[PDB]
Each structure stands twice: as structure tokens, then as C-alpha cells.
């Protein structure tokens, strides 16, 4: 009869039919990932085409129910999610051109091979050929050669493609009643219709700048300390007053600074907290690793893994004959089927990754009661943040002592906490200006603030101003230096890492306050606390049914993203860096003083 009842029957047939088609598509993707064979590729492509065609037909049918005659918040949220045209609003020729451009960028990035001129008999791919060179070499000209040659080949191939990509995506976004593609990406954090908890697309950029303004002193001190250490490592290249050379940051693009921990260690003489040898001595299998992770999650009060998880997951590499993707991925296949695909080794990194992916599985299990189209995180930040909090808690020395992996007579003094916090800052704090600068540059490109002939002149100007990283040699407009990264070349949002980083420490402070921890925030373990698990599970059970602002109120008691938990986490390290930077100069100059 009424429009709302029609929409409810439609979203009762949709959830079941989409759940079935989803499960089938996800199972085909799983069978491709654990078994790389051509029939599995064909089955994956067929299932994906059926899934996409079904989503197109339901999007075509969902728009005939007007939004303003529906008052129920959940029904309006599902109808708002379904009624998005996506690429369907664009013409078929331009949609096909956009899909072709995305596929050819994927092939160029995946199969991009670059090696030294005059020695072309063999070449190295990005993973792991160039990654290992960027992460382990100490030679200036070798890193300069790899960086400039890979950005030359990839940028000169991708620059016309990216020029077409920005125009097509802007055309689709303006066809979808958005200002630009940046507004389309920022619409994930848009909350409309809830009194008090409304969030605007324009408020996101202002909040990011407001948080980054408080990020900036800690990043300036960390940049000065890393600059001094790299000056020690490389005597003449780095200037005391200037920016860091681009090819010396330990990774291909500057995404993480975690590969500079060896060069920039405060106290090399003091030991590390590596527990790998203890697991080797006690013969810890990957099954034992996942059982210890399950013990951690039952200690906080969350549900334990299902029998189908243990039966159907692949937690060891299958062998030479059967090929599988080595990347750890948590799969919520649907219908209560939860799996982890990880080639787990006996390392600390794999143990923390197992905790992170089981946190993903716990998040997926929590919203299983919700309808199918609301089975996601409230935003893109929460889903990664709930795994990163498990990665934080599992990495603590108290957790390692509790599970027996660390010696009970290990001395926890200030120096090990300082160097551990510096490593966590290089991994976590260092990615924040790069993420913010990349997203702000992409937003200005989509908005039209920067003309196509001035993309790179502004970009390096941004990198000097924000990241404090100078180009080795000037680049003209024939280069496409941003698109060498995986996320930007393959049409992925990048602000999820920034939001994940802030939500991680906000959740960490909230759970540690819930668990009544009485020490430093980085010394906090959330095991054995039922109330902290209850506070987590109240937000976890909601899924996408409620606004992310209300979920953040449910956890931390605040209506907005906050930067103070991050600064509280690194406060001992912040005081130590302020003490160590008395002789040196904090901050950088945007001039060409080191090298150009």
C-alpha cells in the first residue's frame, strides 16, 4: 500500500537475493585466491559479472521509491546506499573508456618492470625486487636511480591516462550531483537526517586541517631527529636547514618510515622485544598463534571463532604445486562464514597480523545480525581501526609476558619504551603528513583548484610545505609521480589511513579507560577486561545502522575525531625528542638547500 511498506518488502527480497549472490561471488573469489587456476579465474569473472549486473538492476529498481516519503532511518540508509548510480549515470562509451583506463592502469602497475639502462638482460619488478632495494640499501645513487627510473617509466606511461581519468571521474561525480570526485569520496562521512549528529562533506577537510595543525609539532621534531640521523648516515647530502631527500625514506614512495628504524635507533646497545626466537624454541605452530589470539579475544569478552573458521581457513602455505596469494586477508563470505587467508610464518609480524585479521573477523561477526546492505563499518576508518587496536594490544610486553612468549625477568626500562615508541611513530605518525598531502592534492585536482599544467609545481611545493621532503632533481609535467602508488592508480580512497590512525588511539584511550589501566597508554593491555569488551561490542554490533559520530560517542564519548589520544600515546617520546632537539633546528626550509 504505502511507499514505506513497498520499500520494506523490496529490502527484504533484496537482502536475501544479494546475500546469496554475494556468498557465491565471495566463494568464487576465495577459490581463486587459494587456488590460482584458469577455471577459478573464469568462475570469479562470471560471478563478478552476475553480481555487478544484479547490483545495476537493483539500483535501477531502487530509485523508483522516493527518499522523502520514508521516515525510518535504517530503511532510508539502505535506500540511500542502493540508489547511487555509480558509473551508470555516465554514457556507455565513457563508462567503457573509464573501465578500460582502470584496467590498463592495473596492468601497468602490476606488470611494471624497470631496470638499469645498458644492462637489460634481466629486470626487477616492484614487489619484491624494488621493495627490498628501497628498504635495505644504503647507497645514495642506487636509490636515486631506482626512484627516478621507476617514476620516469610509470609516470610517463600513466600521465595521459590520469589526465583522462580525472576528467571522466569528475564528469561522473557532477552527473551524480556532487561537486567533484573528492566530494564523492568525502560523502562516505556525510551524515544527514540525525539531530545533532549530522556531519557534512565540507567539515571533513576542516577537521583534517585542525587535527594536522596539532600533528605538526610532533612531526617536525620527528623529522628533525630523522634528518639528524640521516645526516649521520649520509654526511654531505642532507642539509641542517632543508628538507629530506625523497629517495632516502626507506620505502618506494614515502608511505612508511618503518625501514629507517635501524639507522635512527636511539639505543642500539639495548635489546629489542623480539619474541621470534622464543616461539622457535617452544615450536609454536600457526594454529597455536591463532588459538592464542582467540584466547585474547575470549579474555576481553568477545565471542570465540566458529568451527567453520577452523575448518575452512587456509593458515599455512599450501605448497609448490598449488599457488595462492600470500597477502593476509580476512574474508566475510556471508551467511556466518568467516575465513582468514594468510601464509603464516613464525614471526612477530605474522602474529600481530593474525591478531589484526582476527580483529577484522570479530568486527565482521559482530554485525552479522544486521541486514545485508548495512553489514559494513560506519565509515571506512572504523573497520581498519578495530584491527589496529588489536595490533596495538597484542604488541605490548605485558601481553607477551602473559602468554609466556617473553621472559618474566625482562627489565622494562624507559629506553626500550622510547625506542619502541620511536618505531611506532615512524610507522604511524610518519604516514600522516604524506596521507594528508596526497588527499589534499587529489581534492584540489578534482576540485579544479590546480590546472593540469601546474599539477607538479604545486605538488612538490606541497611536499616541501607539508611532508618536508624535497625532490632530488626538478620534475616537469611529463612525469606522473603520485600515480606510482597502488591506491591512487587503482581508484582507492586514501583518507581511510588518516581516519584509522586517529580512531585507533581514540579507541585505545577509551578501552584503556574502560579497563582502568593506571599507567602509560602505550603500556596498556585490554586483556581480561569484560567491561572494555562490552564497550567495544556495543559499537561493533551496530555496523552501518548508526552514524559514525554516534558510534564514536558510544566508544569515546565525543562527537568528532580527536587528535589528543595520539599525542598522549607518544608523549614520553615527544618529551624525549624535545630534549634531543636542543642543539638541532626543529622545522625545515622549503628552499633548495640540500640538493636540487
Amino acid at each position: 500500500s504505502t511507499i514505506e511498506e513497498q520499500a520494506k518488502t523490496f529490502l527484504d527480497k533484496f537482502n536475501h537475493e544479494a546475500e546469496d549472490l554475494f556468498y557465491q561471488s565471495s566463494l568464487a573469489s576465495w577459490n581463486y585466491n587459494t587456488n590460482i587456476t584458469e577455471e577459478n579465474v573464469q568462475n570469479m569473472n562470471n560471478a563478478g559479472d552476475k553480481w555487478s549486473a544484479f547490483l545495476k538492476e537493483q539500483s535501477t529498481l531502487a530509485q523508483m521509491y522516493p527518499l522523502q516519503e520514508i521516515q525510518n532511518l535504517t530503511v532510508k540508509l539502505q535506500l540511500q546506499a542502493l540508489q547511487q548510480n555509480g558509473s551508470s549515470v555516465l554514457s556507455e562509451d565513457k563508462s567503457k573508456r573509464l573501465n578500460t583506463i582502470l584496467n590498463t592502469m592495473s596492468t601497468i602497475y602490476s606488470t611494471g618492470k624497470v631496470c638499469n639502462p645498458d644492462n637489460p638482460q634481466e629486470c626487477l619488478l616492484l614487489e619484491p625486487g624494488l621493495n627490498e632495494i628501497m628498504a635495505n640499501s644504503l647507497d645514495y645513487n642506487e636509490r636515486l636511480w631506482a626512484w627516478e627510473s621507476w617514476r620516469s617509466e610509470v609516470g610517463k606511461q600513466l600521465r595521459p591516462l590520469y589526465e583522462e581519468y580525472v576528467v571522466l571521474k569528475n564528469e561522473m561525480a557532477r552527473a551524480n550531483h556532487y561537486e567533484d570526485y573528492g566530494d564523492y569520496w568525502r560523502g562516505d562521512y556525510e551524515v544527514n537526517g540525525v539531530d545533532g549528529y549530522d556531519y557534512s562533506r565540507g567539515q571533513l577537510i576542516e577537521d583534517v586541517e585542525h587535527t594536522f595543525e596539532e600533528i605538526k609539532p610532533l612531526y617536525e621534531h620527528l623529522h628533525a631527529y630523522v634528518r639528524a640521523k640521516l645526516m649521520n648516515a649520509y654526511p654531505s647530502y642532507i642539509s641542517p636547514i632543508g628538507c629530506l631527500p625523497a629517495h632516502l625514506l626507506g620505502d618506494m614512495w614515502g608511505r612508511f618510515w618503518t625501514n629507517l628504524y635501524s639507522l635512527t635507533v636511539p639505543f642500539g646497545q639495548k635489546p629489542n622485544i623480539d619474541v621470534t626466537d622464543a616461539m622457535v624454541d617452544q615450536a609454536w605452530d600457526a594454529q597455536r598463534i591463532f588459538k592464542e589470539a582467540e584466547k585474547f579475544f575470549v579474555s576481553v569478552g568477545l565471542p570465540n571463532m566458529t568451527q567453520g573458521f577452523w575448518e575452512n581457513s587456509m593458515l599455512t602455505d599450501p605448497g609448490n604445486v598449488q599457488k595462492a596469494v600470500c597477502h593476509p586477508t580476512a574474508w566475510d563470505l556471508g551467511k556466518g562464514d568467516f575465513r582468514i587467508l594468510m601464509c603464516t610464518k613464525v614471526t612477530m609480524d605474522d602474529f600481530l597480523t593474525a591478531h589484526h585479521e582476527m580483529g577484522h573477523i570479530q568486527y565482521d561477526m559482530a554485525y552479522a545480525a544486521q541486514p545485508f546492505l548495512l553489514r559494513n563499518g560506519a565509515n571506512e576508518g572504523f573497520h581498519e581501526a578495530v584491527g589496529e587496536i588489536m595490533s596495538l594490544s597484542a604488541a605490548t610486553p605485558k601481553h607477551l609476558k602473559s602468554i609466556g612468549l617473553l621472559s618474566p625477568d625482562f627489565q622494562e626500562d624507559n629506553e626500550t619504551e622510547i625506542n619502541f615508541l620511536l618505531k611506532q611513530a615512524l610507522t604511524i605518525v610518519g604516514t600522516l603528513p604524506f596521507t594528508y598531502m596526497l588527499e589534499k592534492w587529489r581534492w584540489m585536482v578534482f576540485k579544479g583548484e590546480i590546472p593540469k599544467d601546474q599539477w607538479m609545481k604545486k605538488w612538490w611545493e606541497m611536499k616541501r610545505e607539508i611532508v618536508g621532503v624535497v625532490e632530488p632533481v626538478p620534475h616537469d609535467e611529463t612525469y606522473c609521480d603520485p600515480a606510482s602508488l597502488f591506491h591512487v592508480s587503482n581508484d582507492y580512497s586514501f583518507i581511510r589511513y588518516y581516519t584509522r590512525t586517529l580512531y585507533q588511539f581514540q579507541f585505545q584511550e577509551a578501552l584503556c579507560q574502560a579497563a582502568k589501566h593506571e599507567g602509560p597508554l602505550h603500556k596498556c593491555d585490554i586483556s581480561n577486561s569484560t567491561e572494555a569488551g562490552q564497550k567495544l561490542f556495543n559499537m561493533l554490533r551496530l555496523g552501518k545502522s548508526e552514524p559514525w559520530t554516534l558510534a564514536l560517542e558510544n566508544v569515546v564519548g565525543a562527537k568528532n575525531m580527536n587528535v589528543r589520544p595520539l599525542l598522549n600515546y607518544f608523549e614520553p617520546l615527544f618529551t624525549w625528542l624535545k630534549d634531543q632537539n636542543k642543539n638541532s633546528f626543529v622545522g625545515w626550509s622549503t628552499d633548495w638547500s640540500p640538493y636540487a
Binding site: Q6, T9, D12, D20, Y23, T306, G336, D337, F338
Partner: protein
């Protein structure tokens, strides 16, 4: 995927106790007549459970048998088994033979 098992997802009114509906008539959710075609606002009532072995415990198939016991004015004939205590002779015992 086993698609031999089906359930009714839509009906105009709730079922009465111990009622069976096996009708396959197209459900009318709107004012517009369905006319036998599964178009806009007109859905097919019976949907299938795609039972696969790798499902979760809350989605796995469960066979349910419901036993309904009624006492009516007719003679009750479905009785439970009555045991037979080993007969003892030549002693003063309390005997119960067929009531």
C-alpha cells in the same frame, strides 16, 4: 547449492495455527495489479535457502519435527509402552493385570 528447500517470505496476513499455504500466487505489495508478472512492486512469495556445507551454524539446515499431542473425546489410542515386571508366584503380591 541445494535449492530444493523453500520458504514463504510474503503474505497479506499472518498464518493461523497449524495452517499450510502452498499457493504460488504473486505477492502484491502495491496498489497496482501484478497480472502474473514479477515486475515493479510484485514479488514471488517463495524463496529458496541455498544450503551449502560451508555455512555457519546459524545458517546450516536443521530438520525440525514438531509433535502435537491432543486429547479429544474419542478413545485415546496412542499410548506409551508399559513395562512388565517379572511375574512372581506363590507369594502375596499386589498384581496389576491389564488395569
Amino acid at each position: 547449492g541445494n535449492y530444493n528447500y523453500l520458504y514463504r517470505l510474503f503474505r497479506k496476513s499472518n498464518l493461523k495455527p497449524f495452517e499450510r499455504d502452498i499457493s504460488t500466487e504473486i505477492y502484491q505489495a502495491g496498489s497496482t495489479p501484478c497480472n502474473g508478472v514479477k515486475g515493479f512492486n510484485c514479488y514471488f512469495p517463495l524463496q529458496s535457502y541455498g544450503f551449502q556445507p560451508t555455512y555457519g551454524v546459524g545458517y546450516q539446515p536443521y530438520r525440525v519435527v514438531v509433535l502435537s499431542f491432543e486429547l479429544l473425546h474419542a478413545p485415546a489410542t496412542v499410548c506409551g509402552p508399559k513395562k512388565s515386571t517379572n511375574l512372581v508366584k506363590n507369594k502375596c503380591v499386589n498384581f496389576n493385570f491389564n488395569g
